[PDB]
Amino acid sequence: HKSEVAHRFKDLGEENFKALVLIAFAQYLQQCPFEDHVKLVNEVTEFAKTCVADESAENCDKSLHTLFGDKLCTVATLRETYGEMADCCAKQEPERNECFLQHKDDNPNLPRLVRPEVDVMCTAFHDNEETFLKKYLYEIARRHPYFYAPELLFFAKRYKAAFTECCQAADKAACLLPKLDELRDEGKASSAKQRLKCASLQKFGERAFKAWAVARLSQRFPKAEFAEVSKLVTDLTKVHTECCHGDLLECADDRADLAKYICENQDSISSKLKECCEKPLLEKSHCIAEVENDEMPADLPSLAADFVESKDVCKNYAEAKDVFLGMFLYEYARRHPDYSVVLLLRLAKTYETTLEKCCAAADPHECYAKVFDEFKPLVEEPQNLIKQNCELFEQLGEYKFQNALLVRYTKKVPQVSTPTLVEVSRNLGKVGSKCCKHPEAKRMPCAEDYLSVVLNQLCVLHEKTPVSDRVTKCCTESLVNRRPCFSALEVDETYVPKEFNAETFTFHADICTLSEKERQIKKQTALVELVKHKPKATKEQLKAVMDDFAAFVEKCCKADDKETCFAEEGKKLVAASQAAL
Ligand SMILES: CCCCCCCCCCCCCCCC(=O)O
Ligand SMILES: CCCCCCCCCCCCCCCC(=O)O
Ligand SMILES: CCCCCCCCCCCCCCCC(=O)O
C-alpha cells in the first residue's frame, strides 16, 4: 500500500467510492451546487483509477488527507463563499485538515428539504435514477456535515430500494410514504444517538462511558470472558473518542480495526458473528454494531459468592476499584439482557456506594451482607412502570393512549409550548406501540433505547427555550438519572389557569378534509389548551368534554352546510363545556 487512494478504491469498489467522495465533499463544501461536486467526484475517481493501474503514478503516493485538502484548495470561489475556510489552504498538512474540520458548519442556513409529490419523485427516479438519488444524497450530506458518511450511505441504499419497489406499484404513495417516514425518523434518531454519546463522553468523562460499554458489551457477548470484554471496552472507547472528533478517515480506520479484531476472535466473543464477518469492509462494523445478543451460557452461578459472601471483598475491591466494579457489572450484565443498560448502571453505583461505606465500617462483612436487597426496588421501578403504561396502551390503542399522556404531562409541566407537548406525547405513544409488542423480557431495553431519543429531543428544545427549572434539572442530570428524574415530576400546583381564548376553541369544517394525522394533531392541540385552561379538571370531566367534542365533529362532518354546523353547534359545545368545568 504505497497508494492510499488505490487501496481505498479497491476495498470499496467504484460505486461506493464515488458515493463516499460525494458525501465528503458535500460535508465540507456545503454551498457549492451539485454540479461542482459531480465534477470533483469524477476528477478524484479518474485519478483513483490511475493509481489502481500503477501505484507509482505521479501523486498516488500522497495521503488521502493531502489530496482531499488540495482539491478543496482548488475551488476558485473558496474565499468568496466560505471566508475563513480559505485561510486553511495556507497551512501545511497536519494542521490544514484540522483547520477544515473546524470550519464545517453544523446546521447551516439552508431552506427545508420539501418532499415532492410521489409521482414527481417516481418520475424523476425513472427519468434519471443516478442524479435523482445523488442530488438527494448531496442535499442530506450538506445539511448534516458531521453525519458519519458510511451510515449516510447505508441510508441512501434503503431509499434506492424503497423507490425501486414502490414506484412500479399501482398504488405508489401508500407504499412509499410510510417507508420515507420510517427512514426520516431512523435518520433523525441515529443522528441524535451520535450527538448524545459525544456530549455524555465530554460532560461525564471516560470512566462513565467505559461503565456503560462494559454493561452493553457484556449483554451482547455473554460468553466472552471479562478480560476480552475489557479489551473491547478500551478499543470501543478509543473509537468513540476518535469518531466524536469527527475526522472521517480516522474514525473509519478505527472502526475497521475493531471490526477486524472482533471478526478474527469470533470464537472468544459470540457465535452470532459469522455472517457480519463475511461482509465487505464497508459494511462489517455496522453489521456487528447491530448484532443480536448472544445466548448466555447455561451454567451460571449466583453473584453472591464473589461479591457478597467472599472474605476478600474489600481487599479485591481496594486493589483495583474500577476493575472490581467492572467485573460486577460484567457478571450482572450478561445474566440480564432484559435489563436496560442504565438499570445495570444504577445497580453498579449502588454496589459501589455500599462498598465505599461498608469497607470502612466496624464489620464490613455484616455491613454489605444484604446489599442485593437494595437492588430489588431499582429493578422493580422500571418494570412496574412498563407494566402499568403497557396495560394502559392495551386498553386504549395508540391514539387514545397518546391523549392520556397529553393530560398527564400537560398537568405536570403546563408552561411547555403546546406544539412541543403535542409532539413528545405523540412520540411517547409510538414508543408504546413499538415496545409493548415485545415479550416482557425485551421491553426494558426497547424502552431505554427509544425513550433516550424522545428525552434528548426534549432536552435539546428546552436548552434553547427554557421554561421549567425541573425540566432543566432532569436534562442536566447523568444519563443514568434522566428518565427517573422525568418520572418523578409531579403536578404543577403553582400554575395559574390560562385565559380563555375563543379562537383556540373554534373549529371549522376543513377539519373534515384533513388527513387522519392532521385531524388528530388539531384535536390533541385542543386537548392541551383545554387542560391548560382548566388544569384542575378531573378525568371524568375531561372525558365528558371529549365525548361531546367527538360527537360534535361527527355531526357537522355529516351535515348539509357543514360550516354553519361548526359555528352553531360549536357555540353550544363551548358553552356546555364551560358550564361543566
Ligand atoms: C481524495 C480523497 C477522497 C475522499 C475519500 C473518501 C474516503 C471514504 C473511506 C471511508 C471508509 C469506509 C469504511 C467503513 C469503515 C467502518 O465504518 O467500519
Ligand atoms: C473494564 C473496567 C471499566 C471501568 C468500570 C467502572 C465501573 C463503575 C460502576 C459505576 C457506574 C457509574 C456510572 C456513572 C456515574 C458517575 O459518574 O458517578
Ligand atoms: C422543552 C421542554 C419540554 C418538557 C416536556 C415535559 C413533558 C414530560 C415528559 C416526561 C416523559 C418521560 C417518561 C416518564 C415516564 C413516567 O411518567 O414515569
UniProtKB/Swiss-Prot annotation:
Zn(2+) binds at residues 65, 245, 247. GO terms for cellular component: blood microparticle; cytoplasm; endoplasmic reticulum; endoplasmic reticulum lumen; extracellular exosome; extracellular region; extracellular space; Golgi apparatus. The modification N6-methyllysine is found at residue 532. Changing residue 65 to A: Impairs metal binding. The record marks 197 as: Aspirin-acetylated lysine. It comes from Homo sapiens. This is Albumin. Transmembrane segments: none annotated. The record marks 2, 18, 39, 62, 71, 91, 104, 134, 157, 172, 179, 188, 193, 203, 210, 238, 260, 272, 284, 357, 370, 387, 400, 412, 430, 434, 464, 473, 498, 517, 522, 536, 539, 555, 558, 562, 572 as: Not glycated. The keyword Transmembrane does not apply. Changing residue 373 to N: In Nagasaki-2.
